[PDB]
Design a protein around this ligand. Structure first.
Ligand code: HC4
Length: 124
């Protein structure tokens, strides 16, 4: 899939993409509901993080899968955006729960229709 990380229309291009289409992206992509439950999780993310994309669907990202992101700097920004109904933030972060610390760039952006939210990830 020919889509770049951080592109200004990314929510339109990814919108309603099925699981197989998402696996073709060059960067990690997760779709969360407003509570942080995982709706979609692509192959590129599983390769970065080691998690199995099939097993994490339905788990809570902030409680279960990613406690290192349960902080003001990640989860706090997510819940603020869910509450306001808009979200578009990009920052660097370190994942250090199930592996050696790994630095990434994260882009969280509200998905175009409904009340769903994207978390995009690439290595830095
Ligand atoms: C810290 O606990 C981060 C964990 C994590 C980040 C991203 C993922 O896709 C899965 C786990």
């Amino acid at each position: 899939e020919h889509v770049a990380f951080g592109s200004e229309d990314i929510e339109n291009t990814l919108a309603k993409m099925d699981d197989g289409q998402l696996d073709g992206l060059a960067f990690g992509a997760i779709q969360l509901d407003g509570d942080g439950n995982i709706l979609q999780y692509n192959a590129a993310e599983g390769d970065i993080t080691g998690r199995d994309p099939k097993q994490v669907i339905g788990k809570n990202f902030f409680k279960d899968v990613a406690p290192c992101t349960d902080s003001p700097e990640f989860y706090g920004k997510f819940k603020e955006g869910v509450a306001s109904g808009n979200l578009n933030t990009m920052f660097e972060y370190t994942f250090d729960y199930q592996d050696t610390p790994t630095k990434v760039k994260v882009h969280m952006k509200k998905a175009l229709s409904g009340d769903s939210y994207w978390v995009f990830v690439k290595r830095v």
